[PDB]
Scaffold this active site. Sequence first.
Site, PDB file in Angstrom:
ATOM      1  CG  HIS A  49      26.611  -1.944  -1.089  1.00  0.00           C
ATOM      2  ND1 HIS A  49      25.749  -0.909  -0.825  1.00  0.00           N
ATOM      3  CD2 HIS A  49      26.216  -2.994  -0.336  1.00  0.00           C
ATOM      4  CE1 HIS A  49      24.866  -1.309   0.079  1.00  0.00           C
ATOM      5  NE2 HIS A  49      25.122  -2.595   0.387  1.00  0.00           N
TER       6      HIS A  49
HETATM    7  C1  LIG Z   1      30.695 -10.556   6.338  1.00  0.00           C
HETATM    8  C2  LIG Z   1      30.405 -10.159   4.901  1.00  0.00           C
HETATM    9  C3  LIG Z   1      30.676  -8.883   4.445  1.00  0.00           C
HETATM   10  C4  LIG Z   1      30.407  -8.486   3.119  1.00  0.00           C
HETATM   11  N1  LIG Z   1      30.689  -7.197   2.740  1.00  0.00           N
HETATM   12  C5  LIG Z   1      30.408  -6.851   1.494  1.00  0.00           C
HETATM   13  C6  LIG Z   1      30.647  -5.505   1.061  1.00  0.00           C
HETATM   14  O1  LIG Z   1      31.067  -4.637   1.801  1.00  0.00           O
HETATM   15  N2  LIG Z   1      30.322  -5.175  -0.233  1.00  0.00           N
HETATM   16  C7  LIG Z   1      29.844  -6.096  -1.107  1.00  0.00           C
HETATM   17  O2  LIG Z   1      29.603  -5.710  -2.257  1.00  0.00           O
HETATM   18  N3  LIG Z   1      29.608  -7.381  -0.737  1.00  0.00           N
HETATM   19  C8  LIG Z   1      29.859  -7.740   0.505  1.00  0.00           C
HETATM   20  N4  LIG Z   1      29.613  -9.039   0.918  1.00  0.00           N
HETATM   21  C9  LIG Z   1      29.046 -10.018  -0.020  1.00  0.00           C
HETATM   22  C10 LIG Z   1      27.551  -9.894  -0.162  1.00  0.00           C
HETATM   23  O3  LIG Z   1      26.827 -10.082   1.058  1.00  0.00           O
HETATM   24  C11 LIG Z   1      27.091 -10.922  -1.183  1.00  0.00           C
HETATM   25  O4  LIG Z   1      27.890 -10.847  -2.359  1.00  0.00           O
HETATM   26  C12 LIG Z   1      25.646 -10.756  -1.630  1.00  0.00           C
HETATM   27  O5  LIG Z   1      24.753 -10.768  -0.518  1.00  0.00           O
HETATM   28  C13 LIG Z   1      25.267 -11.864  -2.577  1.00  0.00           C
HETATM   29  O6  LIG Z   1      23.906 -11.658  -2.987  1.00  0.00           O
HETATM   30  P1  LIG Z   1      23.079 -12.878  -3.567  1.00  0.00           P
HETATM   31  O7  LIG Z   1      21.979 -12.217  -4.325  1.00  0.00           O
HETATM   32  O8  LIG Z   1      24.106 -13.794  -4.171  1.00  0.00           O
HETATM   33  O9  LIG Z   1      22.541 -13.558  -2.237  1.00  0.00           O
HETATM   34  P2  LIG Z   1      22.321 -13.074  -0.740  1.00  0.00           P
HETATM   35  O10 LIG Z   1      22.330 -11.582  -0.651  1.00  0.00           O
HETATM   36  O11 LIG Z   1      23.294 -13.853   0.097  1.00  0.00           O
HETATM   37  O12 LIG Z   1      20.825 -13.605  -0.561  1.00  0.00           O
HETATM   38  C14 LIG Z   1      20.653 -15.038  -0.459  1.00  0.00           C
HETATM   39  C15 LIG Z   1      19.394 -15.325   0.316  1.00  0.00           C
HETATM   40  O13 LIG Z   1      18.941 -16.651  -0.023  1.00  0.00           O
HETATM   41  C16 LIG Z   1      18.263 -17.188   1.080  1.00  0.00           C
HETATM   42  N5  LIG Z   1      18.224 -18.630   0.900  1.00  0.00           N
HETATM   43  C17 LIG Z   1      19.268 -19.523   0.833  1.00  0.00           C
HETATM   44  N6  LIG Z   1      18.863 -20.749   0.596  1.00  0.00           N
HETATM   45  C18 LIG Z   1      17.484 -20.641   0.471  1.00  0.00           C
HETATM   46  C19 LIG Z   1      16.475 -21.580   0.203  1.00  0.00           C
HETATM   47  N7  LIG Z   1      16.718 -22.863  -0.022  1.00  0.00           N
HETATM   48  N8  LIG Z   1      15.200 -21.129   0.124  1.00  0.00           N
HETATM   49  C20 LIG Z   1      14.962 -19.825   0.326  1.00  0.00           C
HETATM   50  N9  LIG Z   1      15.830 -18.855   0.596  1.00  0.00           N
HETATM   51  C21 LIG Z   1      17.083 -19.339   0.652  1.00  0.00           C
HETATM   52  C22 LIG Z   1      18.999 -16.682   2.309  1.00  0.00           C
HETATM   53  O14 LIG Z   1      18.028 -16.606   3.333  1.00  0.00           O
HETATM   54  C23 LIG Z   1      19.513 -15.305   1.848  1.00  0.00           C
HETATM   55  O15 LIG Z   1      18.670 -14.264   2.335  1.00  0.00           O
HETATM   56  C24 LIG Z   1      29.873  -9.434   2.228  1.00  0.00           C
HETATM   57  C25 LIG Z   1      29.597 -10.731   2.696  1.00  0.00           C
HETATM   58  C26 LIG Z   1      29.806 -11.083   4.017  1.00  0.00           C
HETATM   59  C27 LIG Z   1      29.495 -12.486   4.473  1.00  0.00           C
HETATM   60  O1  LIG Z   2      24.095   5.187   4.493  1.00  0.00           O
HETATM   61  C1  LIG Z   2      23.717   5.100   3.324  1.00  0.00           C
HETATM   62  N1  LIG Z   2      24.579   5.131   2.305  1.00  0.00           N
HETATM   63  C2  LIG Z   2      26.022   5.244   2.498  1.00  0.00           C
HETATM   64  C3  LIG Z   2      26.704   3.895   2.477  1.00  0.00           C
HETATM   65  C4  LIG Z   2      26.280   3.008   3.624  1.00  0.00           C
HETATM   66  C5  LIG Z   2      26.977   3.024   4.823  1.00  0.00           C
HETATM   67  C6  LIG Z   2      26.606   2.215   5.889  1.00  0.00           C
HETATM   68  C7  LIG Z   2      25.542   1.379   5.723  1.00  0.00           C
HETATM   69  F1  LIG Z   2      25.181   0.582   6.766  1.00  0.00           F
HETATM   70  C8  LIG Z   2      24.826   1.310   4.557  1.00  0.00           C
HETATM   71  C9  LIG Z   2      25.205   2.135   3.506  1.00  0.00           C
HETATM   72  C10 LIG Z   2      22.294   4.957   2.995  1.00  0.00           C
HETATM   73  C11 LIG Z   2      21.185   5.102   3.749  1.00  0.00           C
HETATM   74  C12 LIG Z   2      20.082   4.845   2.898  1.00  0.00           C
HETATM   75  C13 LIG Z   2      20.604   4.549   1.658  1.00  0.00           C
HETATM   76  O2  LIG Z   2      21.963   4.622   1.708  1.00  0.00           O
END
Ligand SMILES: Cc1cc2nc3c(=O)[nH]c(=O)nc-3n(C[C@H](O)[C@H](O)[C@H](O)COP(=O)(O)OP(=O)(O)OC[C@H]3O[C@@H](n4cnc5c(N)ncnc54)[C@H](O)[C@@H]3O)c2cc1C
Ligand SMILES: O=C(NCCc1ccc(F)cc1)c1ccco1
Lengths: 486, 483
Positions: free
Chosen positions: B459
């Site tokens: 993703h």
């Molecule tokens: C810059 C960046 C780029 C990334 N790119 C990718 C990528 O390309 N592909 C990929 O697979 N992964 C990517 N990741 C990693 C990805 O975002 C995380 O692995 C993923 O979001 C983790 O999901 P989660 O379910 O652990 O928590 P998250 O998706 O982080 O959800 C956690 C949520 O908990 C909430 N929260 C925290 N504390 C509390 C609280 N006390 N009470 C209530 N809510 C709270 C926050 O508001 C947040 O919305 C990237 C991360 C970053 C920072």
């Molecule tokens: O674009 C989509 N998928 C391709 C990968 C991707 C690229 C860029 C993104 F921001 C987010 C996903 C898509 C639209 C609705 C559901 O999947």
Amino acid sequence: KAFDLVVIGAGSGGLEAGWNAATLYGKRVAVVDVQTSHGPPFYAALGGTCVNVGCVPKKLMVTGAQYMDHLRESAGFGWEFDGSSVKANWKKLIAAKNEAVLDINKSYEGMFNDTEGLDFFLGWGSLESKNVVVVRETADPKSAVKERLQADHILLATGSWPQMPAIPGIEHCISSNEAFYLPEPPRRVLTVGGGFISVEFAGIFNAYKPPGGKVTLCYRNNLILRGFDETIREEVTKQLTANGIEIMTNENPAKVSLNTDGSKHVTFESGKTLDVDVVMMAIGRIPRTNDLQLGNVGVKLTPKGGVQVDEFSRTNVPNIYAIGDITDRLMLTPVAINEGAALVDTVFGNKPRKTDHTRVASAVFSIPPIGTCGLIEEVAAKEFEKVAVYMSSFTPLMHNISGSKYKKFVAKIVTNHSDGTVLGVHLLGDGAPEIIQAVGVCLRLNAKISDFYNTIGVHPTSAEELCSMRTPSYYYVKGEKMEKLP
Amino acid sequence: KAFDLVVIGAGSGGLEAGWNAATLYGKRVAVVDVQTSHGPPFYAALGGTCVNVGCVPKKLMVTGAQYMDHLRESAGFGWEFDGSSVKANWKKLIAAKNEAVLDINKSYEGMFNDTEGLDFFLGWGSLESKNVVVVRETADPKSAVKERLQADHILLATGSWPQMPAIPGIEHCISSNEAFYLPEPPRRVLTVGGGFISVEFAGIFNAYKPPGGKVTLCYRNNLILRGFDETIREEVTKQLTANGIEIMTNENPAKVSLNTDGSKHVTFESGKTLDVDVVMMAIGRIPRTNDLQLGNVGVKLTPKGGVQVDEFSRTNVPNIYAIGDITDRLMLTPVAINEGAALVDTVFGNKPRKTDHTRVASAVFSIPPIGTCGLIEEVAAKEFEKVAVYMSSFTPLMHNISGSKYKKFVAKIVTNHSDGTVLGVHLLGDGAPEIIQAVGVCLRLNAKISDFYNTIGVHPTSAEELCSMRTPSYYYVKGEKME
Ligand SMILES: Cc1cc2nc3c(=O)[nH]c(=O)nc-3n(C[C@H](O)[C@H](O)[C@H](O)COP(=O)(O)OP(=O)(O)OC[C@H]3O[C@@H](n4cnc5c(N)ncnc54)[C@H](O)[C@@H]3O)c2cc1C
Ligand SMILES: O=C(NCCc1ccc(F)cc1)c1ccco1
Ligand SMILES: Cc1cc2nc3c(=O)[nH]c(=O)nc-3n(C[C@H](O)[C@H](O)[C@H](O)COP(=O)(O)OP(=O)(O)OC[C@H]3O[C@@H](n4cnc5c(N)ncnc54)[C@H](O)[C@@H]3O)c2cc1C
Ligand SMILES: O=C(NCCc1ccc(F)cc1)c1ccco1
Ligand SMILES: [Br-]
Ligand SMILES: [Mg+2]
Ligand SMILES: [Mg+2]
């Protein structure tokens, strides 16, 4: 107020677990998050880190950055225009990303509204007792109690948060979180870290920098992208350099001082300085455990601050589970989602299932990008007596004509040479992330190198290189690298 | 001279077979082709159709065509430049493509110089006897003899050739062959055919046409790209249309005359008329067997004109074999190549192997492109009692920003629903040809839909759609579709 399942964090893992529990098993679910849409103050919100300040906006912004290459590269194919008229409007890009992320925020709002017994609670979740989640107004346990949620089961899914190195002038620096909302593109920028976030952002800032701009990426050790294939790590370093990004390896900020013009004077440990408009720290992300008050129901962390779990996402405390970045393992959205779906299928579906953390396809949207699945050869060579490395570097024909002759495509297959089983596949080049997905399925099916070489190529593609490699380039024998077997 | 193997056609299959026989089995090998480098007069040459006037040049040209979309789409991501300064220089494209094709030509020359026991002969191969290939000055069998080559074994690998409908004014029309060498990009072009070549060239011409230009594609039947997934066929029609290509379905050229200015007057069977600078016939490709004088050794042909082969590429005459498009099975370079390797392993290896023509990953370099492997649903439905179709369709996020909101990605998995075995995977959208390759490997391993949806997504990608489909969109039961 009574819930089958309370989820703290409406993110990648939390929503998957939430929506599955509700829709698949008619269970009654609360999801707590601190914000309903993206941006300051809390950055993450409904949808989680990936949706708000991660994969989604990152990928849109890397797609933006890719036009710097396309515009240049088009000339080789006979495209003519006024190069002097080309401007990269950062403000436009950020507005477009903002609208895209907001539409997703609103999408999940719809999901909670429509869906029976799936309720969103706004606020900070923490643990009072083994079966009670208190929703507070703020991160302070001292702040007002918006709600009291009784829970047959509690799911910790609060994800991770950038680590800011406690150096003098760290309040002058930003994380990825702030990078997403810069009102102007930095002319000069230091991205701090050799991981995917530092690398991805160096590409983004490189494409959108105003004239006389310079992107500098610093990494504390010798070679960026630890844990990726070494050939790929060296190649990405060259390709980022070829595109005008300055890579400072074996270098680390000692402190930062605001000059009088508002710019940042960075002093490194080597004693070098650099002036930049932005210092973006991307040295690590750490699990969001503090604000949950785990010491109030005794949930064990690991020596790295991540919530300890077994294979079924279970804490020491019965009925308290943890998935995603809070567990401090693979910090990836689809792993969080997989753990969430598995937890709910186990606990509520009576179909116990464990996430496989092996052979996970992942990517770096570097320009050009990495796609990888399974073991790098160094890791393989420690577990297997005989490891074969198959490898094909080629300048893609289009990049002869494009003028980007530095864009070498790299395809590596690491096998168990005893039975030819594919241990890992490592791609550098346009399409790498797209190519690798179905490679993940191949590794789950225990594909051998001969299943690859006996499959007929799709021509012309970079992917067909994977079905064209029959002879190892070299081997590891009992951990020792060598051209040929004895 | 005397050879273990003589190959007529220095193309995808012929070079694979000849290189393998020489270098892997240590045989003494002759290969014959009519040209050492690309282009007029015989278009194919050392390297085959793919290198000279197929996959290689067409992909370079589709890559070029792709920048029309990139330049426009850049603006959603905040790129700004003088749009009125924008010219598509077709001359540079062609010059760039020619140099790229010539370097391949030259490297094949060097391969023949450098490979001991692998000899190239220039000119026209034909069978004199069952152990004698004659190389002549021209296609005409009366033409001067250049060589006479004694051969234990003979491989026919002469590929295929554009089909031109015998209509009045056919001489004012061209095929893909001439299209690769047009000196100027036509302002108005009719591509004739609903197959990959008509569609791919429609896109190429569409990007490089001079201002106020127009591309028209006509197809006899109701929907382009027969043999492809039906949803993909209807979407690629929409997406071509949305990029300003005029799709004329249930339409076929009756005849062509020159207007006074030398433009072509197209009279469609429907009575309808079109004025165009170029008419490109892409209605079919037929085996090249006429010039081989196969009557001289009684090699069995089909009415079509293909060399009939068993599963091991053996003709009815022992020691004579055909691989590639000349066999008229699957006209793809990697199939030709696979057939060539498998033959040499059969004859000289005593390691008998046949090419599997099922579950072959293929692509169409439309804009956006197609990637496909295995059966479409209508096919699967006739063969299997219960067929599941898993479908995901959406405008990808970046195309909401880009402006190309018409660019729907389509991912469809077709399964035998009795056991979940994947029969077919059909992709339309950016990356589709790159995504489908490793899907080919999956279908060889008898992947089921559970193997796809239990695999963790990468993703954000289009490909992860393939690993996010838990539940059928609809079914076929005993050939009948069931929501
Ligand atoms: C810059 C960046 C780029 C990334 N790119 C990718 C990528 O390309 N592909 C990929 O697979 N992964 C990517 N990741 C990693 C990805 O975002 C995380 O692995 C993923 O979001 C983790 O999901 P989660 O379910 O652990 O928590 P998250 O998706 O982080 O959800 C956690 C949520 O908990 C909430 N929260 C925290 N504390 C509390 C609280 N006390 N009470 C209530 N809510 C709270 C926050 O508001 C947040 O919305 C990237 C991360 C970053 C920072
Ligand atoms: O674009 C989509 N998928 C391709 C990968 C991707 C690229 C860029 C993104 F921001 C987010 C996903 C898509 C639209 C609705 C559901 O999947
Ligand atoms: C426009 C176009 C685009 C294509 N795109 C693709 C694609 O993207 N992917 C794909 O997989 N396939 C593609 N194909 C198909 C692919 O080119 C063929 O399937 C493949 O080249 C056939 O290989 P072969 O060995 O059968 O013959 P060829 O590669 O065609 O080789 C035949 C050779 O024999 C020579 N020859 C003919 N008659 C004689 C004679 N009497 N004596 C000596 N030499 C002779 C010819 O000059 C030629 O070099 C495309 C075809 C075309 C026309
Ligand atoms: O470019 C290459 N690969 C990508 C696909 C492709 C594009 C265009 C082509 F003409 C031919 C193949 C390549 C260079 C050397 C070997 O493969
Ligand atoms: Br039809
Ligand atoms: Mg609801
Ligand atoms: Mg030689």
